[PDB]
Design a binder for this molecule. Structure first.
Ligand SMILES: C[C@H](O)[C@@H](CCOc1ccc2ccccc2c1)n1cnc(C(N)=O)c1
Ligand SMILES: [Zn+2]
Length: 349
């Protein structure tokens, strides 16, 4: 089978989109959750998509399974730990993982998410656990792992606590900020809570990535770059609809976090169309290949790779190239990027 049986780097995957179904059951059946069903095959098949959906229809999934994990300490710990594992079975050697800690919390968080009750798990505490899990999972599985904390676009009130967590826990495991969920709310890239957050990030040396351009216009991408000063774009596919912006982003070596399979499944790409990634490759962009949410997309990294291999003509040399871009564009300190990259090169020859 495997499309590209070599070392990979991955930079765009959500923790809470990367949970074993079996451990969602464990925790609902534990805590008393109630769930679309009670067998893992079923379970995947319902939080699995295989069809674009409305945003409603898509967020309701997070509504079922998140309350099995959010608020539980052994759960936060365990999903982080199990994820590292998943990724080693993918052949990843370095991953950045992102998530929102407020969306695992059930205390000093307002509004409390997921219809949860309060409870004694705070946002800060969540990231302690997660990274505990990533670390020991690093130790045992052999993947080198960092984490990215996510502001949410509809909730600029969390954004500076997001920033501060990143500073508080930086270089183990947290290496950067993200901005996530729902691009389409008007002006949200320019919400003062987000833009003071990303400026604080610049001020404190934390790395920036932003969602922009999976579902929003090229205007949102230009917001990510010019106002929030991102160093990388999550997805970025709509930047193609504005060509000076595409021209300038290709020329400041801007990194795109591509997610092929994520984008058919979501509708972000219409499948009658040049997939963004083939153009991106034709133009020699800086990009990665990425999973986004394997639970939801019924995926693995090899899924992504199979797609671009079988239907987009890609090729092991690009595969090698793009993973080398991922390593160059990682949020590691340079002494360790270079260590990442020298591993990759050796492996690639
Ligand atoms: C960032 C977190 O790690 C988490 C957030 C889950 O809850 C949400 C909440 C609101 C949203 C509104 C629009 C789009 C996605 C949303 C995801 N998450 C997981 N995957 C995604 C995604 N694919 O967009 C976002
Ligand atoms: Zn994402």
């Amino acid at each position: 089978t495997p499309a590209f049986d070599k070392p990979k780097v991955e930079l765009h995957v959500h923790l809470d989109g990367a949970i074993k179904p079996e451990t969602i059951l464990y925790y609902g059946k534990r805590r008393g959750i109630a769930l679309p069903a009670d067998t893992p095959e079923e379970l995947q098949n319902i939080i699995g998509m295989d069809k674009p959906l409305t945003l409603p229809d898509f967020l309701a999934k997070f509504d079922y399974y998140m309350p099995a994990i959010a608020g539980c300490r052994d759960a936060i710990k365990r999903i982080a730990y199990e994820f590292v594992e998943m990724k080693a079975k993918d052949g990843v050697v370095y991953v950045e993982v992102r998530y929102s800690p407020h969306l695992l919390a059930n205390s000093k968080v307002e509004p409390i998410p997921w219809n949860q009750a309060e409870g004694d798990l705070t946002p800060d505490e969540v990231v302690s656990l997660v990274n505990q899990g990533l670390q020991e999972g690093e130790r045992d599985f052999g993947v080198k792992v960092r984490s990215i904390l996510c502001c949410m676009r509809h909730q600029p009130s969390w954004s500076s606590e997001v920033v501060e967590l990143c500073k508080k826990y930086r270089e183990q495991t947290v290496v950067a900020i993200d901005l996530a969920g729902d691009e389409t709310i008007e002006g949200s890239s320019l919400f003062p809570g987000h833009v003071q957050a990303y400026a604080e990030a610049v001020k404190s040396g934390v790395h920036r990535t932003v969602h922009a351009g999976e579902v929003g216009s090229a205007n949102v991408v230009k917001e990510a770059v010019d106002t929030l000063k991102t160093e990388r774009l999550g997805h970025g596919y709509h930047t193609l609809e504005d060509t000076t912006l595409y021209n300038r982003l290709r020329q400041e070596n801007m990194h795109f976090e591509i997610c092929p399979w994520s984008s058919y499944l979501t509708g972000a790409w219409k499948p009658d169309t040049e997939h963004a990634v083939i153009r991106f490759k034709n133009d020699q962009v800086n990009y990665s290949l990425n999973t986004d949410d394997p639970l939801i997309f019924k995926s693995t990294l090899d899924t992504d790779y199979q797609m671009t291999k079988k239907d987009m003509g890609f090729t092991e040399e690009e595969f090698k190239r793009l993973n080398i871009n991922a390593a160059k564009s990682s949020f590691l300190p340079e002494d360790e990027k270079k260590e990442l990259l020298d591993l990759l090169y050796k492996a690639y020859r």
